[PDB]
From Swiss-Prot, chain A:
Descriptive protein name: Large ribosomal subunit protein eL20
Keyword Ribosomal protein belongs to the record: yes
One annotated Gene Ontology cellular component of this protein: cytosolic large ribosomal subunit
GO biological process: cytoplasmic translation
Alphabetically ordered keywords of this record: Ribonucleoprotein, Ribosomal protein
Gene label: RpL18A
InterPro entries, alphabetized: Ribosomal_eL20 (IPR028877), Ribosomal_eL20_dom (IPR023573), Ribosomal_eL20_eukaryotes (IPR021138)
PANTHER family reported in the protein's UniProt record: 60S RIBOSOMAL PROTEIN L18A (PTHR10052)
Gene3D superfamilies cross-referenced by the UniProt entry: 3.10.20.10
SUPFAM superfamilies named among the record's database cross-references: RplX-like
Record bears the keyword Ribonucleoprotein: yes
A Pfam family hit: Ribosomal_L18A
Family indicated by similarity: Belongs to the eukaryotic ribosomal protein eL20 family.
Single GO term (MF): structural constituent of ribosome
UniProtKB/Swiss-Prot annotation, chain C:
Compositional bias segments (type: Basic and acidic residues): 146-157
BP terms from Gene Ontology: cytoplasmic translation; negative regulation of neuron apoptotic process; ribosomal large subunit biogenesis
Molecular function GO labels: RNA binding; structural constituent of ribosome
Protein name (database record): Large ribosomal subunit protein eL14
Lineage summary: Eukaryota, Metazoa, Ecdysozoa, Arthropoda, Hexapoda
Protein keywords: Ribonucleoprotein, Ribosomal protein
Species, as recorded: Drosophila melanogaster
UniProtKB/Swiss-Prot annotation, chain D:
Keywords, alphabetical: Ribonucleoprotein, Ribosomal protein
Gene3D superfamilies registered for this protein in UniProt: Ribosomal protein L6, alpha-beta domain (3.90.930.12)
Organism placement in taxonomy: Eukaryota, Metazoa, Ecdysozoa, Arthropoda, Hexapoda
Organism: Drosophila melanogaster (Fruit fly)
Gene: RpL9
GO molecular function (one): structural constituent of ribosome
Keyword ATP-binding: no
Protein name: Large ribosomal subunit protein uL6
Gene Ontology BP, a term: cytoplasmic translation
The family this protein is said to belong to: Belongs to the universal ribosomal protein uL6 family.
GO cellular component labels: cytosolic large ribosomal subunit; cytosolic ribosome
UniProtKB/Swiss-Prot annotation, chain E:
Highest taxon above the source species: Eukaryota
Alphabetical list of InterPro entries matching this protein: Ribosomal_uL13, Ribosomal_uL13_CS, Ribosomal_uL13_euk/arc, Ribosomal_uL13_sf
Gene3D superfamilies (alphabetical): 6.10.250.3250, Ribosomal protein L13
One GO process term, biological-process aspect: negative regulation of translation
Record PROSITE patterns: RIBOSOMAL_L13
Protein name, as recorded: Large ribosomal subunit protein uL13
Alphabetic keyword roster: Ribonucleoprotein, Ribosomal protein
Similarity section: Belongs to the universal ribosomal protein uL13 family.
Pfam family, one: Ribosomal_L13
GO CC terms in record: cytosolic large ribosomal subunit; cytosolic ribosome; ribosome
A GO term for molecular function: mRNA binding
RNA sequence: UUUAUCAUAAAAUAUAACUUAUAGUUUAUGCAUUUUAACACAGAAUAAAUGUUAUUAAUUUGAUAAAGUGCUGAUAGAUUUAUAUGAUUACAGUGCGUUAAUUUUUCGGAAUUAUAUAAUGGCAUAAUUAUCAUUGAUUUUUGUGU
RNA sequence: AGUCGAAAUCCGCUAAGGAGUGUGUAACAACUCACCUGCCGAAGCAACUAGCCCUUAAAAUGGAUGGCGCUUAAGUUGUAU
RNA sequence: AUGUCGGCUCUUCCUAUCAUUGUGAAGCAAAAUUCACCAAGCGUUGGAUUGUUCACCCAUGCAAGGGAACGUGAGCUGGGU
RNA sequence: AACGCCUCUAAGGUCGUAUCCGUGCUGGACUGCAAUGAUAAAUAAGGGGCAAUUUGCAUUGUAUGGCUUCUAAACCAUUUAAAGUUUAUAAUUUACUUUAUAAACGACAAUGGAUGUGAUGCCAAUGUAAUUUGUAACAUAGUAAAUUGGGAGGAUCUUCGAUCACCUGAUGCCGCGCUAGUUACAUAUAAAAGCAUUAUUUAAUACAAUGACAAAGCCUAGAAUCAAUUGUAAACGACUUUU
C-alpha cells in the first residue's frame, strides 16, 4: 500500500481488582485500519502483559501529518531481522509526508537487504532538520542553489506508433 | 488502448470472403453470389490495449485467422 | 556545461505524462533524484510534488528564494512577464496543433483539405521553372517559346 | 549512489589550440596534432568559450566518475605530446653477448639480434608517427620519439617484452632491453 | 502497395536490439503482417562480445552425434542469426505459423528495392531507448564474422556503393526543394490560395 | 494544510552597491570596458522570503459512508398446448359528476385552505423503567400542552 | 660498543633522539625510522555486518529458466493499477 | 525370458592432465625436476604366466594418463562360472 | 583512475596456445541460385513463340458504394540515454570537409507522422457518382504532349536483368488538349413509396490480370531417351564414350 499513520491506544479491560487500567498508545504505520490494530497487539505482546482479550483498543485515529508541502528530511530508526541477523539500523529519506517516508523505507529496505516487511520494526520516526542528517545521499540534496541538469523524462517508449517513422533523437538540443 | 476499442462495441462486424458457387438468383438488390459474409456483432473489449471480442452468427473457420473482417460503423451512437 | 535544461529553482517546466499534462508549472525545490516540488499559480496548479519523468523543461528560469510561498512565486510569475512571451515561444506555436490540428472537426476538415488541391494545381504548373542548362532553349521550344513567351514579356504569344 | 556532479577542467595553455567536437578532442600545437576520441566514456565535454576544456559527468555511479580524473589526464598528456613530445629510453643490459641492436632508414622500426647468441633475428615494428633511431652519446642506448604517449610507450614496450629469456631462469639471466628514462623531447633542456 | 497496411513494412535493423526486434516482428507477422527487415549486420546484441561469442560458440557444438548432418544446422549470416530468433517466437510446426515466416524476408545489407522504399524504426526495440550507460553491447556484424561469415566485406563495399549514389540522389533533391521554395513564391497571389491551410497550420507558415 | 490577516521575530537564500578572482577585451606589464554560470552572508535596503504567535476568504484539503443524486452507454438471455381437467384479477394509471380565491401562461396548467386521524417526526412540560458516567447525558413507559 | 637474544633502566640532551627502529649486516661504526615542525589543507582510518554478484562449483550422445531470447530487463527484492 | 564373465574387433564421448603446445612459481645457476593455470588437439605400445578384471615381470620409451553406455554374443569366440 | 600518491583496469589500447573459428580439402538449400546453348515434326498445310497486343467473348484480382486511396523521390557518413542536432555566416575545402563566430531547439505541449520530406491525391464537374452534365464574359498564371544520329548512365536469390533512363546531334512545327479565380448562361441526368430499407453487401466505372474462341501481323524450323558400342565405369541402375 502506502502506509498511512495511526495512533492506537490500549486499555487492559478493567477487571474488578483494578478498575482504570492505564491506557498506553502507539504510532503505527499500516496500509489499512484493521492491520494497524494488529500491529498494536504484536507490539503489545512485548512490553505489557496484556493480550486480546485481556485488553481493548480505545480510540484510534489516522493522522494526517502537519505540513504536507514542506521538504523535511526524515530520519527513521529501525530494527530488522536478517537471515541470521537481527540488527539495528538508522536510515534517512526526504519526503513531504511521514507515511511517505516510511513506505520509502520499506521498498528500499526490502530491496537493498531482502528484508521482508514482517521482519522490520519501526522504533522511531522523526523529522531531522539539516546538519544532523548523516547519510550522504540526503545531504547532497541540500545546497540551494542546486543546478543539476539531468535532462530527465521517462521518455515514453515509444509513442502511439509501434512502427514509428521518426527516430527519437533524445537530447533535443 | 482500451478507450479506443471501447468505441466499436455494438457495431455489426462482418467477415467477408468468397466461394465458387452462385446457386442463387439476384433476389434482392441484384445478387451475384460470389461473395460470402458472416455477419456478427462486436460484444465487449478484450485487451488492456484495445483488442476486442466479437460473437458472430456462425463461428469463423480459423483459416480466417489473419484475414480481414470489416467492423461496420453502423449501428452508431454519434 | 552547454547550459542545458537545469532542474533549478524555479526552472519553468511543462508537464506531460501525468495528470498535469498541458500545464506550465514552476519548480520550487528538489526532493529526490526523481521528484521535485511544483507550483504554478497562474496556470492553475497548486503546490504538489511531481515525478520528474513527467515534466519536460523549457528555457525559462525565474528568480525566487527556494523557500518561497506561492504568493511570491505568483508575484514573480507575472513580474518577469511569462504569460505574454510564452504564447509566442518559437515552438509554442507548435503547441497549437493541440488547439487547431487536434480534432479539427468534420465541420473543419474538407475546406482545410480541399484547398490542398487548389494549392497544388497551381504548384505543379509552377514546375519546369527551369534555369539548369536549358536555357537555351531545348528544342522543340520553337513551339514552346510561344508557350514560354507567356512567362517573360508577355505580349502576346511567341514571338 | 548516483552522485550529481564531478567535473574537471583541464588548463589549456596559450600556445596550443584545442577543439572538442561532439566528443572527439583535436589538439594542435608545436609538434603536430593528436585527434583522439572519447565516444565511449560518455562524459559531457565542453570548452566553456575560453581556452580551457571541462569534462563533466552527471549522475554516474561510482565507477563512472573514476573516469573523470583520467580523461582530464589523457588530455594533459596530449598537451605535452605536442609541445614537448614523448621520448623513452632503452638501455639493453646484457651479460656475455652484446645485444647488437640496430635500426636505420626506413627501417625506423628496429632490427635487433644476438639475444642470447640465438640466431633468431628479432624484429619489432613501431606505431605510426613514431620513430626509433639508436641513441648516440651512450653505449647501447635507444631513443623512441613521438607525440602520442601510448604510441611511444606501447611501441617501446614491444622492444622490452621481447626480448625476454624463455624456458630458463630469469633471476640470473637478466638480459634484455629495459626502459630507464621516460622523458620529454624538448622540456626543458631535452 | 495495398494490404492490411501495405504489402510490406520495411524495417531498418540499425541500432535495434536483436530479440526485442524479433518478438515485435514475430507478433506482427502472426497478425497477417509482411515485414522485411534490412541491414541485419547492424542489429545490436546486448552484453559485450565475449559474452555472445561464447553463446554462439555453444550453439554450434549442439550437433547430432549419430549423423551430424541431421543435427541443428547453424546458419552464420547476420540475417539468419535474426531469422533464427523469429522462429523461436513463431509456432513453426503449424501450417499457420509457417505462412508467418513466409511473409518474412530478412536481408543484411539493404538491397534491391528495399533501398528506395521507406523503411521505419521500431522505438520499442531501439538500443538507446533500452540499454543503459556503462553497458557494453555488440553487433551481429562482428559476431557472424568471428563465427565464419564469408561475406562481411562483400556487403560493406556494396553499402558504400549505395551510400555513394545516395549523395547523387540527394543533390538531385536538395536543390530541387530549393526550386520549390522559389516555386512557392509565385503562388502567394494565386487567388486566395494558402489561407485555408495556414489557418489550421501556420506553424510552418 | 493552502490562499488570506495579525503581531513580533530574526533573517539559512532572491531582487538589490561596489570588491577582488577569472579569462576573453582596449590602450599604452598594467589600466579601460565587457561575461561572471570565480561571483568576496561584501554591504545597505527589500523579500519582515525564512523564524514566532494567532485568526480566516467562495472558510480551504482529501479520503470514508449513505442517499437516486442525475443519468448516459453496451451485453447475453425471454419457460409457457394458464384448462390441450381451474381466476387473466387484485392492483394501481387514463378519460365523465362540489367549491372558492391565489398565481402564472394566457392555449393549458397553476395554486388554496379548513376536509376527519392515533397522529409518527419537531417543541415545551409532567411522569416513570433503566443506565455510559453522573453538572450531566442516555434512555424507558408514556402522558399532556404546543 | 644502543642494536642475534637483554636482566633492566631512568633520563640527560630536547618542538622532536628510545640503554634505541631496519636488511636473517659476529666488532666500532655506517645507516635509517619512530617522533616533531615545514608542506598541503577536507574529512580521513579500521574492525565488523548482510544484500546481490564472484570464487569454491569436476563427467561422460548434442542440449536445455520448458523454448526463443533478455541485461535503465523479458533478472532479483518491495509494491501499484 | 532384456543371452549372464572376459578377450578380439570397432566407434565416439568425458575430463578427475601422463606426455606435447602456451604460460606462471620454486629452497629455479645449467641439466634434471617439482608446484600451478588455459587446455582434451594428436598419442597412449610388443610380449612371458593366468580364463579372469586390477596383477607383477621382461622390453620399448627425453617421455608408456584415468575413465563412460557393468559399450559391443542374430559381432566372433567359448577359456571362466 | 577511483583513492592528490602507487596500481595491467574501472574506461581505454595491446602480446597470445597443440585449443576454437575459417581457409585449403570432400559432400552440395535429394529436386537450391546464376550464367548459357539450342528451341522441334514440317517446309503444301499445320505446330511452336512474339504480345501490352491492337480485334471481341468472358473471367479473376482490385480501388468495392465515384476513390475505408496511397506514393514504390529522404532525415546521420565510426557513435553516444546529459549524450547534441541543424541553420546561416567567414575561411578552408572533392565533400553539408575542416575551423571559427553566432543562432535556433531547451531529452516539452509538440517530435510516432502527415515536412503528405523532387511537397500526395479527395479528380478537368466550371449540378462530382453505385454514368459523363454544356457555352460565353473577365483576370492572372501559363503547362501537358507526338516523329530523327553520337555520348556518358544503370546489376545484392530479379515484382521483366544485352535491355535500360537521362543527355547532345538533330528530325520536326501539338500550335491536338492546359489550368486556377470571378461572374453569366446552356441543358441532360439523378428519386429503389423504405417512411423503425439493409443483405448469401452486389458490383462496377476504371485499374490490372489471365483465360478461351472465330477474330490481328510478325517470327520459327531442334533434340533427349531407349536399342546397339565403349571400359576411364560397373551388383543393378548410373557414369565415361561412339556412329
Amino acid at each position: 500500500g502506502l502506509l498511512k499513520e495511526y495512533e492506537v491506544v490500549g486499555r487492559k479491560l478493567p477487571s474488578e481488582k483494578e478498575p482504570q487500567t492505564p491506557l498506553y498508545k502507539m504510532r503505527i504505520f499500516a496500509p489499512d485500519n484493521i492491520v494497524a490494530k494488529s500491529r498494536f497487539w504484536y507490539f503489545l505482546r512485548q512490553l505489557k502483559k496484556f493480550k486480546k482479550t485481556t485488553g481493548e483498543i480505545v480510540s484510534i485515529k489516522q493522522v494526517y501529518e502537519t505540513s504536507p508541502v514542506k521538504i523535511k528530511n526524515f530520519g527513521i530508526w529501525l530494527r530488522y531481522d536478517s537471515r541470521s541477523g537481527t540488527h539495528n539500523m538508522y536510515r534517512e529519506y526526504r519526503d513531504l509526508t511521514v507515511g511517505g517516508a516510511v513506505t520509502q523505507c520499506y521498498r528500499d529496505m526490502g530491496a537493498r537487504h531482502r528484508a521482508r516487511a514482517h521482519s522490520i520494526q519501526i522504533i522511531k520516526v522523526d523529522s531531522i532538520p539539516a546538519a544532523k542528517t548523516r547519510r550522504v545521499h540526503v545531504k547532497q540534496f541540500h545546497d540551494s542553489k542546486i543546478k543539476f541538469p539531468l535532462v530527465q523524462r521517462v521518455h515514453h517508449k515509444g509513442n502511439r506508433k509501434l512502427f514509428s517513422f521518426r527516430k527519437p533523437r533524445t537530447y533535443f538540443q | 488502448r482500451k478507450e479506443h476499442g471501447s468505441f466499436y462495441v455494438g457495431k455489426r462486424c462482418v467477415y467477408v470472403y468468397k466461394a465458387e458457387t452462385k446457386k442463387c438468383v439476384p433476389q434482392h438488390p441484384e445478387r451475384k453470389t460470389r461473395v460470402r459474409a458472416v455477419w456478427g456483432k462486436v460484444t465487449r473489449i478484450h485487451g488492456n490495449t484495445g483488442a476486442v471480442r466479437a460473437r458472430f452468427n456462425r463461428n469463423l473457420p480459423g483459416h480466417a485467422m489473419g484475414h480481414r473482417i470489416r467492423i461496420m460503423l453502423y449501428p452508431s451512437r454519434i | 556545461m552547454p547550459f542545458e535544461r537545469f532542474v533549478q529553482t524555479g526552472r519553468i517546466a511543462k508537464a506531460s505524462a501525468g495528470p498535469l499534462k498541458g500545464r506550465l508549472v514552476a519548480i520550487v525545490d528538489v526532493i529526490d533524484q526523481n521528484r521535485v516540488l511544483v507550483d504554478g499559480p497562474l496556470t492553475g496548479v497548486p503546490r504538489q510534488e511531481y515525478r520528474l519523468n513527467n515534466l519536460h523543461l523549457t528555457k525559462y528560469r525565474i528568480k525566487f528564494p527556494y523557500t518561497a510561498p506561492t504568493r511570491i512565486v505568483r508575484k514573480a510569475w507575472t513580474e518577469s512577464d511569462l504569460k505574454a512571451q510564452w504564447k509566442v515561444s518559437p515552438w509554442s506555436v507548435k503547441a497549437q496543433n493541440i488547439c487547431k490540428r487536434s480534432s479539427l472537426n468534420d465541420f473543419d476538415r474538407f475546406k482545410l483539405r480541399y484547398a490542398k488541391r487548389q494549392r497544388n494545381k497551381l504548384l505543379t504548373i509552377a514546375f519546369n521553372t527551369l534555369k539548369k542548362r536549358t536555357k537555351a532553349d531545348g528544342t522543340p521550344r520553337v513551339l514552346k517559346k510561344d508557350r514560354r513567351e507567356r512567362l517573360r514579356a508577355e505580349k502576346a504569344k511567341g514571338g | 549512489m548516483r552522485t550529481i556532479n564531478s567535473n574537471q577542467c583541464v588548463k589549456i595553455p596559450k600556445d596550443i589550440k584545442a577543439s572538442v567536437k561532439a566528443r572527439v578532442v583535436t589538439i594542435t600545437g608545436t609538434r603536430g596534432t593528436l585527434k583522439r576520441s572519447f565516444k565511449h566514456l560518455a562524459l559531457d565535454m565542453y570548452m566553456p568559450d575560453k581556452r580551457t576544456l571541462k569534462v563533466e559527468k552527471w549522475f554516474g555511479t561510482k565507477k563512472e566518475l573514476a573516469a573523470v580524473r583520467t580523461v582530464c589526464s589523457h588530455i594533459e598528456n596530449m598537451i605535452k605530446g605536442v609541445t614537448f613530445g614523448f621520448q623513452y629510453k632503452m638501455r639493453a643490459v646484457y651479460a656475455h653477448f652484446p645485444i647488437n641492436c640496430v635500426t636505420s632508414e626506413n627501417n625506423t622500426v628496429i632490427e635487433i639480434r644476438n639475444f642470447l647468441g640465438e640466431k633468431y633475428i628479432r624484429r619489432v615494428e613501431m606505431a605510426p608517427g613514431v620513430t626509433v633511431v639508436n641513441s648516440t652519446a651512450q653505449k647501447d642506448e635507444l631513443i623512441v620519439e613521438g607525440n602520442d604517449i601510448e604510441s611511444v610507450s606501447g611501441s617501446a614496450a614491444l622492444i622490452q617484452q621481447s626480448t625476454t629469456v624463455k624456458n630458463k631462469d630469469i633471476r640470473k639471466f637478466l638480459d634484455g632491453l629495459y626502459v630507464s628514462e621516460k622523458t620529454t623531447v624538448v622540456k626543458l633542456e631535452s | 502497395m495495398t494490404g492490411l497496411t501495405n504489402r510490406t513494412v520495411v524495417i531498418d535493423g540499425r541500432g535495434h536490439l536483436l530479440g526485442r526486434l524479433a518478438s515485435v516482428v514475430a507478433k506482427y507477422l502472426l497478425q497477417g503482417g509482411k515485414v522485411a527487415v534490412v541491414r541485419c549486420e547492424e542489429l545490436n546484441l546486448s552484453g559485450h562480445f565475449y559474452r555472445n561469442k561464447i553463446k554462439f560458440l555453444a550453439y554450434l557444438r549442439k550437433r547430432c552425434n549419430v549423423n551430424p548432418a541431421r543435427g541443428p544446422f547453424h546458419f552464420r549470416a547476420p540475417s539468419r542469426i535474426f531469422y533464427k530468433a523469429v522462429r523461436g517466437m513463431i509456432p513453426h510446426k503449424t501450417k499457420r505459423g509457417q505462412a508467418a515466416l513466409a511473409r518474412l524476408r530478412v536481408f543484411d545489407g539493404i538491397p534491391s528495392p528495399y533501398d528506395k522504399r521507406r523503411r521505419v524504426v521500431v522505438p520499442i526495440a531501439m538500443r538507446v531507448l533500452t540499454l543503459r550507460s556503462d553497458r557494453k553491447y555488440c553487433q551481429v556484424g562482428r559476431l557472424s564474422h568471428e563465427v565464419g561469415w564469408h561475406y562481411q566485406d562483400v556487403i560493406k563495399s556494396l553499402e558504400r556503393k549505395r551510400k555513394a549514389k545516395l549523395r547523387v540522389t540527394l543533390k538531385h533533391n536538395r536543390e530541387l526543394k530549393k526550386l520549390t521554395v522559389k516555386a512557392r513564391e509565385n503562388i502567394a497571389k494565386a487567388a486566395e490560395p494558402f489561407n485555408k491551410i495556414i489557418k489550421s497550420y501556420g506553424y510552418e507558415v
